[PDB]
RNA sequence: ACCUCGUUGGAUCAGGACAUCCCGAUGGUGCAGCCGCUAUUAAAGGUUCGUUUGUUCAACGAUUAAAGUCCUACGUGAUCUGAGUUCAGACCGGAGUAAUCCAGGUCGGUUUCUAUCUACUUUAAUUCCUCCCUGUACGAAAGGACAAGAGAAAUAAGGCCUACUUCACAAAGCGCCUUCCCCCGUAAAUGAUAUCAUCUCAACUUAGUAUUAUACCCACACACCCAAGAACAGGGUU
RNA sequence: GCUACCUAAGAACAGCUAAAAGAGCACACCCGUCUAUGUAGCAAAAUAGUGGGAAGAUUUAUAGGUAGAGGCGACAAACCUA
C-alpha cells in the first residue's frame, strides 16, 4: 500500500535519491535543459522549483545560502543561481521549469524527459501548438462566441 | 496494559507489599477473558511466594483522554472476598474508578489522593 | 516442481497467442504538421528534438570554448548570434556565443 | 492513420476557445443545477403522508473527515461528516421492473465533467437536464415515497436522532498477504523458521485432495462495498449539507457514500417524524437553523456542561 | 501573534470545507471557554468538570509536555509527580468538561516535545500543585528556558540520544560517553534538513485562518 | 503354548461427525426455589493461558460458560519446525574371546524443490457480568427464581483514523465505530377406530417458525493524476 | 603441485596489557562455534554476522621424500588430485 505516498523511491535509498536528484538539479542549473529518465526528471522538477524559489529568497539569506550550497555540487552554479536565474524568475511566482516527453531512450527503451529552465538561451524546444483558430471547429465556436456575447 | 509475568508495584500499606523480597510481586493471572488488565481489573499476584488478588490502580499504558497516565503499574492487594489487604493507599488513584463496573468503594475509601 | 506433462502446441498456441500477449496497435501516431514527421501525441517529434539537440550541442561547444575550464560559469546572462547578427539594447551586458552558420528558421 | 484516434474535448480546440468552451459549459452547469432549486413549483408528484411500512429515499453524499463530538453525558463519540454535493433524483421505475418487488429511485450526486462521460450517459443527463452525477446508486421505496426526477434532495432529509445505513467501497489495499487480509497468526520469527512468517498454513485436508470454495488466500483486499448498519445522526448542518454519522464510514475521505434510514428491526418506524417523501426548503414552511443538533450533543457555544 | 498549533492542518488530502466547519466549531467553543496561549514546557493547571462525581471540579497542574492532534479533538498531554509518583493527563482542549486552562507560567523550552523528562530525573517534573501564577509583561517575547535536564541511566523510554529526534534540552554529556554519541550519530541523515520538497509552507493556510479567526471576533 | 522384542509430534490453517463439553428447547426426578442427577432434541456458534517433560500423554497452577469425544493418510511437513528409529563421532551399562551386538541411557549431528495441470484466491454475532423486574415467585425460615428490559465489557466479523499510540501528507493497533430471525424435543384443543377416554404415523385446531428477511451491486460502446492498482482493470481531469 | 606426516633451507606475527609466558585483550594471519542466506548457488562447501587461536604443539612460501594391502594418521577408518 502507498497511498499518499509522494515520493519515488530511486537509487539505493533515501540519501541516494537525494543525491541523484542533485546531480541531476546541478546539471540542470549548469546547462539549463537536461535530459534524463523520465521518472527522475519528474521527481527533480519540484526540487528544481523550490531552488528558484531560495534564490529567490536572496543571496544574503543564510538559510538559502546553505540550501544552494547542499543542492549544487558545483560551487560555481551558485553565484549562478542567484545572480541569473532567479533574476530570471523575479517576475513570475512559478512555473520556473518546462518538462516535456522525449523519444524513448535507445540504450533501455526508458521514457525520457526533456527539463529545462524557462528563458534559456538554448534553441527553443518544440513544443506542442494547439490547433489553429482559423479551423473549420474553431471558427464555429468564435461563431457561438459572438452570438453568446450578443444575446447575452 | 497488565498481562502475565509483568512485575507491579504494590501501592498499599499491606505486610506483603511493604516486605522486601528477592522476586518483586509478578503479575500472574489477569482476571479478564482477553489476558490483558487495565486500571479497575483484577489480577492474580504471586508476592513473596503467595498467590495474593490483587486490584489494579494505574498503570504505564496510555488510557482514554482525561484519565492519568501513571509511571508504573500500581496494584492494590485485596482478598478473595474483596476487602483490601492494607489499609491505606499512599499514591494518587485514578478517580475513573469510581464509575467502573465492579466493587471499587472500599479502595476509594482507603485511598488517600485521587487524580 | 518439475511439469508433470509436456505442454501441448495447441495449448501453447492458445496461452502465446492471447490477446493479453499481443502488440496493441497504437492510435496516438500522427505526422507533425510541422515537419510532416511522425511523432506521438504526446511526445515530442524525434526529428525535430534531433534538430534542436544537435544546435544545442554545438552552442554548448561554443559555451566551452568561451569559457575555458571548469567551474567558470558566468554570472551574467548569455545570448546566441549567428552570422549576420549584432547584439541588441537588450542583449547589451550579456556574453555573446557566436555561431558560424546562419538563423535556424525554427530559432527566433 | 487507421481511424481509431482516441480525441478528448480540448484537443482540437485553439486558445482562444479553450477557456470559453470551459466558462460556457461551467455556466449551463450552474444554470441546471439552479433551475432544479424550486421542485415544489414544478409540477410536483403527489407528496403522500407517512404510513407505516414505508420506505423513503436516501442520499449520495461525500466523505469530509472525522472530528470528535461530546455527548451531555460526557462521553466522546467520534463523528464523519458527509456532504450532500448537488444530489439529485435522477430515475424511478416500478416494481414489476425494479428487479424485484419494490419501486426505485436512482440517485446521483457529485457533479463531473461532461467531457469524461459516454454518449449514452451524456445524453441521459441531457434529457433529464442535469449535469452528470458521479455516482448513480438505487434506493428501494415505496410507491408512497416516489420522487419526481430531477429533485434536489439535502442533508436535511435526515434529522438528528436518526439511525442510518451508509453503504461505501472501502479503502482499497491491494492484494494483501493472508495476515493482513485475514488475520491469520503466520509463523514465529526465529527458532529455525526459514522462508515462512507470513505465509498461510495448510490451505486444506489432506483427503479432499482439492481447496474448497471460499478458502482464505491472499488475494485483493478492500474496494469492495461494505455496509455500517444502524449509525446515528448526531447533528445537520443544513447551511453546508452536512450530515454529522456516528462512528466510522467506510471508504477513503472525499468518497461518495450512499446514505440511507437504517433497515435494523430496531429503528423499523421511526420514519413518522422525518420528511416523508424528502425535505423540500421550497416549501419554507419554517426555514431550519444552521444547524440541528441531537438532544443529547454537547453544543460548542454552550456554557460549559457540569454534571450537576 | 501566536495561531494555536491546532488550528494549522496537518497537510492531505481532506476537503478545505471539513477545515472550515471545525474551525468554526472550535472558535464558537473558545468563545465560551479561553484557550491561553501556551507552548511545551509551560505550566498550565487545568480545572475540569468530573462525571464520575455530581458537578465537582478537579484541578491537575503540570508541565504541558506535548502538544498534539488538531481541530477539535487537539490534545495536550502535561505531567507532574504527586507524592513521588509521574502522573501524565491528555487533556482535550476542546472537550466541553474542561472548565478552566491557567497558564501558571508561559514559557518555551528549548524541544518541542518533552517526553524525555519521563526518563529525566523527578525533579524536572516535580511542581508544586498551588505553585503561584507567574506574570509576564503584556509586550514581552515568550521566555525560552534553556534548561538541560539530567537524565537517569541509559535504560529509556526512547533512544533520545538518536538525531531523530532531534533533542536538545539533555545533557547526554554527562549520561552518555563519546563513544555512545558517535554510535548515536549513525543514524544521522544529513540530507534531510535539506530535501525541499519534505518542508510543509503554512503561510497561506497561517492567513486565511487568521482571517477566519478576525472575521469570528 | 520357553524368554524377549517388532515413523512421531508441534506450529499454521483447519474441513467434517454427533456418540453434546458450554450456549438453546423440553420430559422425569429418591428435585419444595436454588440446585444437582437422568433422558429427548439441538452441530448456528464457541471450546484459555502456563510449569516439568521431546512427550504421543500425564500431573500440577490459574482460569473459563465450556476447556467435548472423535474422523479427516501427524487432517495438514513441494507451508515451516522438532524429535526419535539412527545416520557416520564419543562415553556409561549389559552380552560377546574378539569383531561387534543390545530403543538401554547421555552429549553432537546439512535432504532439496524456479508450481506444468487440477483446486482455490471478497458466501442478520455470540457469550458473560451487573442492574431493573427480584428479596419478587417459591419457601416455615434459611436460601432463592423465572420470562422481559437496561447498561457494561470481552471476543468474533466487517470497517475506520477524530483523538491516543507506532507514526506522519499515509499505513497501522495497543485506538475507535457497527453488528439484525428462527428451527420443533414436546405441551395442549376437539375427536373417532374402541359412542368414556385419547395431542391425531385418524380426520382436525394451536404453540409453529425458512418459502432466510433483507440489505449490497446495477449507466453497452492520448496523456496526466489518484484515497484504484503487480500488469490489466477502475476513478478524476470544468 | 590436494591432503597426511617428514626433511632442507626461508618468512610472518600491529597495538595495549604484561614481563622472558604452549600468558591476557585484540589486528594481520590461521580456523570454523552458532545463526541466517545460498541449495544447478558467487561457490561440486560459498557469503554475512558471530565466534576460537593469534610468540607457538603457530601460520606459511619454496624444493625434496614416504605409494595402494602400501603410505600417512595428536584413531576421525581420517587423508593419499572434488
Ligand atoms: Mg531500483
Ligand atoms: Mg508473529
Ligand atoms: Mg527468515
Ligand atoms: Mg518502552
Ligand atoms: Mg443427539
Ligand atoms: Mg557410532
Ligand atoms: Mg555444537
Ligand atoms: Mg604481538
Ligand atoms: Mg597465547
Ligand atoms: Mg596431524
Ligand atoms: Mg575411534
Ligand atoms: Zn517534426
Redesign the interface.
Known amino acids: 500500500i502507498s497511498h499518499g505516498r509522494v515520493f519515488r523511491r530511486m537509487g539505493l535509498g533515501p540519501e541516494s535519491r537525494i543525491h541523484l536528484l542533485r546531480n541531476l538539479l546541478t546539471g540542470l542549473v549548469r546547462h539549463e535543459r537536461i535530459e534524463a529518465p523520465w521518472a527522475r526528471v519528474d521527481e527533480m522538477r519540484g526540487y528544481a522549483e523550490k531552488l528558484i524559489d531560495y534564490g529567490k529568497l536572496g543571496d544574503t539569506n543564510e538559510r538559502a545560502m546553505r540550501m544552494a550550497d547542499f543542492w549544487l555540487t558545483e560551487k560555481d552554479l551558485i553565484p549562478k543561481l542567484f545572480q541569473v536565474l532567479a533574476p530570471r524568475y523575479k517576475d513570475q511566482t512559478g512555473g520556473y521549469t518546462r518538462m516535456l516527453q522525449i523519444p524513448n531512450r535507445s540504450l533501455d527503451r526508458a521514457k525520457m524527459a526533456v527539463i529545462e529552465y524557462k528563458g534559456n538561451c538554448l534553441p527553443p524546444l518544440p513544443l506542442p501548438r494547439r490547433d489553429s483558430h482559423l479551423t473549420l471547429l474553431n471558427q464555429l465556436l468564435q461563431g457561438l462566441r459572438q452570438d453568446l456575447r450578443q444575446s447575452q | 496494559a497488565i498481562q502475565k509475568m509483568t512485575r507491579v508495584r504494590v501501592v498499599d500499606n499491606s505486610a506483603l507489599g511493604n516486605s522486601p523480597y528477592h522476586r518483586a510481586p509478578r503479575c500472574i493471572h489477569v482476571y479478564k477473558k482477553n489476558g490483558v488488565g487495565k486500571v479497575g481489573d483484577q489480577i492474580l499476584l504471586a508476592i513473596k511466594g503467595q498467590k495474593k488478588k490483587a486490584l489494579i490502580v494505574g498503570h504505564c499504558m496510555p488510557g482514554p483522554r482525561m484519565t492519568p497516565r501513571f509511571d508504573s503499574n500500581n496494584v492494590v492487594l485485596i482478598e478473595d472476598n474483596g476487602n483490601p489487604v492494607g489499609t491505606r493507599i499512599k499514591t494518587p488513584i485514578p478517580t475513573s474508578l469510581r464509575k467502573r463496573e465492579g466493587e471499587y468503594s472500599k479502595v476509594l475509601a482507603i485511598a488517600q489522593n485521587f487524580v | 516442481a518439475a511439469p508433470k506433462n509436456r505442454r501441448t502446441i495447441e495449448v501453447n498456441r492458445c496461452r502465446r497467442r492471447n490477446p493479453q500477449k499481443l502488440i496493441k496497435?497504437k492510435?496516438?501516431?500522427?505526422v507533425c504538421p510541422?515537419c510532416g514527421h511522425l511523432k506521438q501525441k504526446?511526445?515530442?517529434?524525434?526529428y525535430?528534438?534531433e534538430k534542436?539537440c544537435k544546435?544545442?550541442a554545438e552552442?554548448?561547444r561554443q559555451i566551452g570554448k568561451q569559457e575555458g575550464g571548469?567551474?567558470?560559469?558566468?554570472?551574467?546572462?548569455?545570448?546566441?548570434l549567428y552570422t549576420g547578427e549584432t547584439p541588441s539594447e537588450q542583449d547589451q551586458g550579456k556574453r555573446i556565443?557566436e555561431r558560424d552558420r546562419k538563423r535556424?528558421s525554427?530559432?527566433? | 492513420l487507421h481511424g481509431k484516434s482516441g480525441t478528448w474535448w480540448d484537443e482540437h480546440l485553439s486558445e482562444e476557445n479553450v477557456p470559453f468552451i470551459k466558462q460556457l459549459v461551467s455556466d449551463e452547469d450552474k444554470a441546471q443545477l439552479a433551475s432544479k432549486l424550486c421542485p415544489l413549483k414544478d409540477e410536483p408528484w403527489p407528496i403522500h403522508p407517512w404510513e407505516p411500512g414505508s420506505f423513503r429515499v436516501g442520499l449520495i453524499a461525500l466523505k469530509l473527515g472525522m472530528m470528535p463530538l461530546w455527548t451531555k453525558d460526557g462521553q466522546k463519540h467520534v463523528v464523519t461528516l458527509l456532504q450532500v454535493q448537488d444530489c439529485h433524483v435522477l430515475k424511478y421505475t416500478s416494481k414489476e421492473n425494479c428487479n424485484g418487488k419494490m419501486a426505485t429511485l436512482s440517485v446521483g450526486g457529485k457533479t463531473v465533467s461532461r467531457f469524461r462521460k459516454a454518449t449514452s450517459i451524456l445524453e441521459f443527463y441531457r434529457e433529464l437536464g442535469l449535469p452528470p452525477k458521479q455516482t448513480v446508486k438505487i434506493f428501494n421505496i415505496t410507491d408512497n415515497a416516489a420522487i419526481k426526477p430531477g429533485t434536489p434532495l439535502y442533508a436535511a432529509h435526515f434529522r438528528p436522532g436518526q439511525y442510518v445505513d451508509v453503504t461505501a467501497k472501502t479503502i482499497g489495499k491491494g492484494f494483501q498477504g493472508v495476515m493482513k487480509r485475514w488475520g491469520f497468526k503466520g509463523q514465529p520469527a526465529t527458532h529455525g523458521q526459514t522462508k515462512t512468517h507470513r505465509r498461510p498454513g495448510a490451505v486444506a485436508t489432506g483427503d479432499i485432495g482439492r481447496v474448497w470454495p471460499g478458502t482464505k488466500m491472499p488475494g485483493k483486499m478492500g474496494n469492495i462495498y461494505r455496509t455500517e448498519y444502524g449509525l446515528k445522526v448526531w447533528r445537520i448542518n443544513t447551511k453546508h449539507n452536512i450530515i454529522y454519522v456516528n462512528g466510522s464510514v467506510p471508504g477513503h475521505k472525499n468518497c461518495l457514500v450512499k446514505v440511507k434510514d437504517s433497515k435494523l428491526p430496531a429503528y423499523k418506524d421511526l420514519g413518522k417524524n422525518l420528511p416523508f417523501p424528502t425535505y423540500f426548503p421550497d416549501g419554507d414552511e419554517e426555514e431550519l437553523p444552521e444547524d440541528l443538533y441531537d438532544e443529547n450533543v454537547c453544543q460548542p457555544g454552550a456554557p460549559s456542561i457540569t454534571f450537576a | 501573534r501566536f495561531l494555536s498549533p491546532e488550528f494549522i492542518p496537518r497537510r492531505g488530502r481532506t476537503d478545505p470545507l471539513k477545515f472550515q466547519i471545525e474551525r468554526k466549531d472550535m472558535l464558537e467553543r473558545r468563545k465560551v471557554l479561553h484557550i491561553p496561549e501556551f507552548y511545551v514546557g509551560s505550566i498550565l493547571r487545568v480545572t475540569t468538570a468530573d462525571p464520575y462525581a455530581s458537578g465537582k471540579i478537579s484541578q491537575f497542574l503540570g508541565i504541558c509536555i506535548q502538544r498534539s492532534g488538531r481541530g477539535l479533538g487537539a490534545t495536550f498531554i502535561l505531567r507532574n509527580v504527586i507524592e513521588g509518583q509521574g502522573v501524565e493527563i491528555c487533556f482535550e482542549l476542546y472537550n466541553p468538561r474542561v472548565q478552566e486552562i491557567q497558564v501558571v507560567k508561559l514559557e518555551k523550552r528549548l524541544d518541542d516535545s518533552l517526553l524525555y523528562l519521563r526518563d529525566a530525573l523527578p525533579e524536572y517534573s516535580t511542581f508544586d500543585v498551588n505553585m503561584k501564577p507567574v506574570v509576564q509583561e503584556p509586550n514581552q517575547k515568550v521566555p525560552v528556558n534553556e534548561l538541560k535536564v539530567k537524565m537517569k541511566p541509559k535504560p529509556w523510554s526512547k533512544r533520545w540520544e538518536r538525531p531523530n529526534f532531534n533533542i536538545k534540552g539533555i545533557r547526554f554529556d554527562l549520561c552518555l560517553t563519546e563513544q555512545q554519541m558517535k554510535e548515536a550519530q549513525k543514524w544521522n541523515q544529513p540530507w534531510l534538513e535539506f530535501d525541499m520538497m519534505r518542508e510543509y509552507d503554512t503561510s497561506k493556510i497561517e492567513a486565511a485562518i487568521w482571517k477566519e479567526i478576525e472575521a469570528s471576533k
Open positions: 496497435v492510435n496516438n501516431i500522427d510541422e504526446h511526445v515530442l517529434c524525434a525535430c528534438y534542436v544546435e544545442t552552442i554548448r571548469p567551474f567558470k560559469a558566468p554570472t551574467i546572462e548569455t545570448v546566441v556565443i535556424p525554427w530559432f527566433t
